[model samples]
Target: AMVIRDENYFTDKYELTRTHSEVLEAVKVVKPGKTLDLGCGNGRNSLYLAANGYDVDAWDKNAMSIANVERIKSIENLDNLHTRVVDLNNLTFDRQYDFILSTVVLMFLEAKTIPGLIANMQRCTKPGGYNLIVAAMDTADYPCTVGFPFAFKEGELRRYYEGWERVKYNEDVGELHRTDANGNRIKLRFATMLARKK
Candidate 1:
């Protein structure tokens, strides 16, 4: 079965503002060069980047989500912002970019593929470029979900940027309370990293 997220999922869950603080800081570091928003669900970050004068390529595998972004891109007159449907599992990056933002998206991949993707991110980054990644880490005490990528071992995110410049790194185990369709509370643990290429 294919997993397809509705347009409302993107619209309702995300806002058209600077949602990722580390990514916002990355924007400041890169200062408006060509950027890629991997797994950009609804153009929130992409729109923000375009508005800030950066040419952005926002890619996702969901068609409906991409459609929602297309509608807003036209309304906002964002010619520099582009959208594409990309299956991350088989994707490769050859073009260099000034910035790359992957927020809570890499968990969808199998663990073995992660290193290759990180390598591509580094290979596709121009000198002085930045990559900001946020991922959920596997830790005791957090509810883990099956059939979906939800956990990375401690220090996993850091190991990927071993030779790169570490700008910011944070990881914690805590309750992430959220309500379901029945309004039940749910909790989880997470880790995040922000690094720049040498």
Candidate 2:
């Protein structure tokens, strides 16, 4: 089962050129190896990983996003990059990976679906592999925001890595403030977790 909303939900929003800071830091820590990028909108992070010598598999539910990724992949000659249109709600991991990154994507799932998703992610991670997850923290004032229909609780991200080695864990209420190319500012209250499999 998957939520089928407007196909252009993300394609109409924004296009990111650089990878997210936490993801960038994760790639630096993880060895150059197979990487999985779930909900890889437009393949910004996947492209970065491919350029950095990691074989990357990027998946998104949006066909347009996948098309854009393919275009960029061809133009940049990123043969190491692969793109797929997948329904994240029913996602399954067919192979293990050295690094897995999912940013600002989990919020689209229902609360009950999150635990299974994380378990699969952890199970698919090779020993000594790393996983990074970023999600907005539940807010008292906000009902919902854009494509994000759900939000995480404080310490929620950390609980998932109870048996893993934590590299970084932060719940930032006011730590992030940035502007896009359009000069629109975004201030987010989110949680980030970077962990290594034991």
Candidate 3:
């Protein structure tokens, strides 16, 4: 879902650094040897992974984000960072990484593209490599359709991972929040899950 950002929206709301810490906590449970952060905005999580003793490679299609990644690298004084600018729709890698991360990114993919994207994500994983995918959960408690694409709860994820084994299912209303687009406050709900390639 392409958010029609009004100039500075990308630099402000979309690039929130708080999400990186959340991801870091989630990944610590798996204890990975290497990590690949897809749709790595501003390379914040990539920097976190690098600092945490993991071989980290992150990519983003936004050139501004790529530049931000470089800036972060210099500020952090880190060298174990491999950052690139690439689209997830055309991703190709052959490394057997221990962890593949896609946080708040899967919603952008159309329903048809989910299968191929999952395949490609798994292709880069070694046996026992973990896949962590997070996205907003479809719920009516919020009672508002921003109308992006995702519109299902846990049941909807089954169709996306029909063949893979679901290792973890964490479906819950995450941080009930309100957003005002023009004037009225819009309530929102969030949900996500993680699975492994069998």
Candidate 4:
């Protein structure tokens, strides 16, 4: 279950060199170790982690999402970063990791599967390692943009990680990294969290 109304809006929208700021916070808590990048669209977070000398395994089902990643790894000689095309609709964690990063990927998946995915995220994480997730949440004041398969409700994200140590959590109206075709910034209520597996 995925909703990519305009896939190119993402594949061709943002700068390829830009790394997610949320990812930067995750790295600070854990030193360079193994990492798993879920739905690493255009390799934003994976490229940054690989460039910093972290061994990263990136996965995405979309062909357009990973096309540039293959092109960039060659030029930069990022041998430590490996990218794979995997469908999230039937995703399973085959290995554990020191850090897992999933940004804006969950909302696109089937809502019923999110909890299972989040549990898998925590289960596959090495003890004391971190899992970082960022997804849009529909609140009374702010609703998710159109075309998303699902959006979490307020106070819904942290509920899944109750047993884990929440290193950080924030719910706020956040702007999309890219502007719309009309040149206006689109904002959505987002829930961001970094929880350490116990």
Candidate 5:
């Protein structure tokens, strides 16, 4: 699934660009020879990886997002990144990866579906590979932000990934910050996670 049709909603929202780098730092133990970007959403991080030399396969359920990604690759003149339509709800890739990044994507999954999805992600990852997951922490007051029907609650989420070794995890709180219709600023809190194969 996708977060939005207007891909730029991201750049206009976050003041930081280092989420990819932060996860990369936590992933130093594993060197990625290839990558699969699940729920890639317009391919920002995926295309960034390709330009930096990693072969990237970016997939999202939204055809519009995938199409925008194709535009990204063509305009960037980068050929290493490939885009396709795939949903996390029923996703299966034939290949494995040394690193997989799923940023701001897992929040949409139902509590019941988390385990199977985590398992499938691990199944498609190399034994020593790293899987980076970013989600809104349960601490957020927002009932259902980021377009998710359900949200997490700290330890409530730990049970879903009992098999993986967590490398880095964190939460950030803000007032759902965004430039409102009247050019007012709003803030929102969020949580993120990154894990590795055991």
Candidate 6:
């Protein structure tokens, strides 16, 4: 349901990077307002949301990623979008937001930090606000990556939001077109959840 771009949107210039599909779904459930993008990899989602009138604060542990976002935000003049460098595990939210997103980020954290990070995400969301998570799941198919710091067991992602109203819960396989060693796209199993806090 996105405009087909010939350019490699995901790996292309920061401006052309595609927003995560789940983020697109999120706004349909929760109107855009103050938003948080935890582990905003390239600011694709943050930039898109801010441009669409969602005041966004995006964070990442990587300094380069933040720099990349910072450079473009001013150029694009998306004053509503902010970027920061913070390790997600060590972060505590000072305020709440209307929507929060975490995509393909949790799989790199140690298992011990996940629960607390999720708790912070929950606490930082305004009641009825939506949280969308797209996390890697345990898979035997792709041998490309030998080891992952953490991978969700099937159904594990949903348990994080027990009482919340679920807009979507899908344990599905998706493809990443950007390839490293092999020219073929890599397959990834993901646990995707979009839920509104009760």
Whole-model alpha-carbon lDDT for candidate 2: 0.78
**TM-score of predicted model 4?**
0.86
Question: lDDT tens string, model 5, 1-198?
Answer: 442313243334432243355544643565646888888886667765676567889888889889987886886666888888976766556688888877777767666666677677778888878777766655545444445655667565456566778776655664444565777554444555577777
Candidate 4, which segments miss by more than 4 Å at Cα?
Answer: 1-17, 177-183
Candidate 3 pairs with clashing backbones: 1-108, 137-191
Say which prediction, candidate 1 or candidate 6, comes out ahead on TM-score. Answer: 6
lDDT of each: 0.76, 0.78, 0.67, 0.81, 0.67, 0.80
| Candidate 2 local lDDT, residue 10 | 26
- TM-score for each model: 0.82, 0.81, 0.74, 0.86, 0.72, 0.85
Candidate 3 per-residue lDDT over residues 96-144, each given as its tens digit: 8888888877666565666677777778877777777777666656532
The numbered model that scores best in lDDT is 4
* Better model by lDDT: candidate 4 vs candidate 6: 4
Candidate 4: residue 101 lDDT (0-100): 87
lDDT of 1 by residue, 18-83 (tens): 446666566656788899899998777777777678899999999998998898888767899999
Order the candidate numbers by TM-score, best to worst. Answer: 4, 6, 1, 2, 3, 5
Worst 10 residues of 1 by lDDT: 2-11
Candidate 4 residue lDDT tens string, 12-115? 44455446678767777878889999999888788778877789999998887787888877876789999999988797776989999899898888877787
Candidate 1 wrongly placed segments (more than 4 Å): 1-18, 141-143, 174-185
Q: What TM-score should be assigned to candidate 2?
A: 0.81
The runs of at least 3 residues in candidate 5 whose Cα sits more than 4 Å from the true structure, single-residue gaps closed, are: 1-30, 110-112, 139-147, 174-189
- Residue by residue across 126-197, what tens digits does model 2's lDDT show? 999999888877656432354466678767788878899999888775432456566665556677889999
TM-score, predicted candidate 1 vs. hidden true structure: 0.82
lDDT measured at residue 141 in model 5 versus the true structure, 0 to 100: 56
